[PDB]
Design a protein around this nucleic acid. Structure first.
Ligand SMILES: [Ca+2]
Length: 74
DNA sequence: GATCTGGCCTGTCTTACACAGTGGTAGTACTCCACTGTCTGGCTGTACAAAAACCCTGCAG
């Protein structure tokens, strides 16, 4: 199997090349698709010319350190 | 084999059923900038009088 060669063959080499493995997973991005879905449901403009423009604008807003920092939630 | 007739099909006309909700854009009717000088009315040191509701008291029964 492919996964087996990967996990036996370069793991020490890669964690030497970088210093971790999970710290470069695409994992998080598959989560963020959830986000996209939700936005499309609720903050749509119902116009395919703009729908993406609006979605991207709201998304970017959602992913700024600034506004999250305002989200204290001690 | 001619005839007939109820039941079936096509086409018809009529009453319903989703299409909100979301963002960008604009006109527009409603509201504070700075500058002002002035006045009323709450505040404050005690002393003075006026109401209120009870508690005792006293006379009356
Ligand atoms: Ca209806």
């Amino acid at each position: 199997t492919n996964y087996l060669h990967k996990t036996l063959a370069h793991v020490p080499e890669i964690v030497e090349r970088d210093g971790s493995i999970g710290a470069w997973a695409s994992e998080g991005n598959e989560s963020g698709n959830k986000l996209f879905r939700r936005f499309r449901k609720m903050n749509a403009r119902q116009s395919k010319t703009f729908e993406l423009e609006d979605i991207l604008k709201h998304h970017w807003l959602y992913t700024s350190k600034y506004l999250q920092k305002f989200m204290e939630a001690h």
